[PDB]
Amino acid sequence: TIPHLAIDPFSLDFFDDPYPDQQTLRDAGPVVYLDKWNVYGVARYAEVHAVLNDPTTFCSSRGVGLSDFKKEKPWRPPSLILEADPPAHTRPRAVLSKVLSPATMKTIRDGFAAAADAKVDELLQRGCIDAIADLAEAYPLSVFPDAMGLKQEGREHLLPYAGLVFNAFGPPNELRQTAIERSAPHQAYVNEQCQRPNLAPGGFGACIHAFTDTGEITPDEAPLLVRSLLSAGLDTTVNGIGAAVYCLARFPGELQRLRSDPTLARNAFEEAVRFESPVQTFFRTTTREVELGGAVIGEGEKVLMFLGSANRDPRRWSDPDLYDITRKTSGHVGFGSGVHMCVGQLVARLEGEVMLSALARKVAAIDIDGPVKRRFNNTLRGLESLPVKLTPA
Numbered sequence: 001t002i003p004h005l006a007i008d009p010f011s012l013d014f015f016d017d018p019y020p021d022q023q024t025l026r027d028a029g030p031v032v033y034l035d036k037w038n039v040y041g042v043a044r045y046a047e048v049h050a051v052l053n054d055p056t057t058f059c060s061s062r063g064v065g066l067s068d069f070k071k072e073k074p075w076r077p078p079s080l081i082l083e084a085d086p087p088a089h090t091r092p093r094a095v096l097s098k099v100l101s102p103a104t105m106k107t108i109r110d111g112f113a114a115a116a117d118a119k120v121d122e123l124l125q126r127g128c129i130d131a132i133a134d135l136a137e138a139y140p141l142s143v144f145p146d147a148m149g150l151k152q153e154g155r156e157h158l159l160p161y162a163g164l165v166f167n168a169f170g171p172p173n174e175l176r177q178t179a180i181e182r183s184a185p186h187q188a189y190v191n192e193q194c195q196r197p198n199l200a201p202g203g204f205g206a207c208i209h210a211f212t213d214t215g216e217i218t219p220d221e222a223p224l225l226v227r228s229l230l231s232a233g234l235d236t237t238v239n240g241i242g243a244a245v246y247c248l249a250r251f252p253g254e255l256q257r258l259r260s261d262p263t264l265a266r267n268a269f270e271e272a273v274r275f276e277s278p279v280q281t282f283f284r285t286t287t288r289e290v291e292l293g294g295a296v297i298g299e300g301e302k303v304l305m306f307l308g309s310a311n312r313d314p315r316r317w318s319d320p321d322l323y324d325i326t327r328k329t330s331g332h333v334g335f336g337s338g339v340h341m342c343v344g345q346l347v348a349r350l351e352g353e354v355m356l357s358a359l360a361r362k363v364a365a366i367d368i369d370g371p372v373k374r375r376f377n378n379t380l381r382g383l384e385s386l387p388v389k390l391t392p393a
């Protein structure tokens, strides 16, 4: 039998303090039912991990938002990659995997690192900064659109476009309906930038389009794949980096360990992703009767996965509520898991690593001094403002 809960995981109150409610989602049972949205959810590591890794039973092509694409109209033309199942998922996934490969990362690494080092130097001259606007936002804006091959004009649409995209996975609450209603200028900007002539040579965009020349993808598929990176590639990392800086500020001891060993940079970042989980929730839809958490769920049912909760499940993590930069982070579901596991994870880890490496080397202390402000999103967790004083090494 399946416990009914009145928790609204897409409400402002939940966003503002999700942890007691997430403990309840986990502790009530391995499978729950949410009265407010009439859907099943699993919040424990074991179930979330199991669902991610059985795409046959828990498919994505019926949407990874609440909306069931088999019965409803998608808010936009579906992603070729995020919202598709094997075998169809395979080819577009292969393309983005090549474009965002370890080898590609070697070619851009030095530029990313110098940008990060320069960015921290610049902030140190001011002292009083906003770790969101001046760092978590500024840094990825300075490297990712260039690495994409994007024109300078119209970049201000990138953040709110991703905000839109992630709200749209949500239920039809105010956050979602207001996003979609204000969407047209963002979409129109994005659609211009997805076209072959507008993407600089040597960038992610052009590289994607090159796959049309070999017959690997069509001229129609090409722009939709660029759309994927512009949908998913920025706001996530912004929140990842913001999360890392927030953790180092709240856990001063962990910052000092990072200064003592800056090679901990990449793992400090991974641990921030586990701890805050910029992407909080995704859905799947059952393709058959299936037993999950000891309950039988019927075919065609949406299932809500609490990734951020799974990453804090005491059944899997010791002292889950502590930021520990030497934790074995392997296994966390912040980037998902299985066939859909984040295809841009190397890009994100590169941005986060080089940026925490710069902080590790150049900063002695990070102190919160001012009102902290949260940004609300149906899917993304992160801060709108984080005033900090940086003290130079």
Ligand code: HEM
Binding pocket: 060, 064, 081, 082, 083, 093, 096, 100, 228, 229, 232, 233, 234, 236, 237, 239, 240, 273, 277, 278, 279, 282, 333, 334, 335, 336, 337, 339, 340, 341, 342, 343, 344, 345, 347, 348
């Ligand atoms: C901290 C940063 C990031 C986080 C937390 C994150 C999170 C995730 C998660 C949880 C998934 C799984 C989706 C699912 O299972 O349905 C995913 C997939 C994906 N991510 Fe990321 N991501 C990040 C950075 C990036 C970057 C930098 C890019 C592109 C440059 C990117 C592009 C994608 C794409 C295209 C997919 C779809 C993969 C597929 O369906 O095969 N993400 N991401």
Ligand SMILES: COc1ccc(C(N)=O)cc1
Binding pocket: 073, 074, 075, 076, 077, 078
């Ligand atoms: C699958 O193709 C489409 C195309 C457009 C839309 C839309 N604009 O909502 C939804 C689905």
Ligand SMILES: COc1ccc(C(N)=O)cc1
Binding pocket: 078, 079, 080, 081, 082, 165, 224, 227, 228, 229, 231, 232
């Ligand atoms: C246009 O296609 C896509 C693909 C992936 C994503 C994402 N992970 O948010 C968003 C949009």
Ligand SMILES: COc1ccc(C(N)=O)cc1
Binding pocket: 159, 160, 161, 162, 163, 164, 235, 375, 377, 380
């Ligand atoms: C997470 O979603 C968003 C939305 C808008 C902005 C912004 N306007 O800077 C930043 C992030």
Ligand SMILES: [Cl-]
Binding pocket: 076, 187, 190
């Ligand atoms: Cl769009």
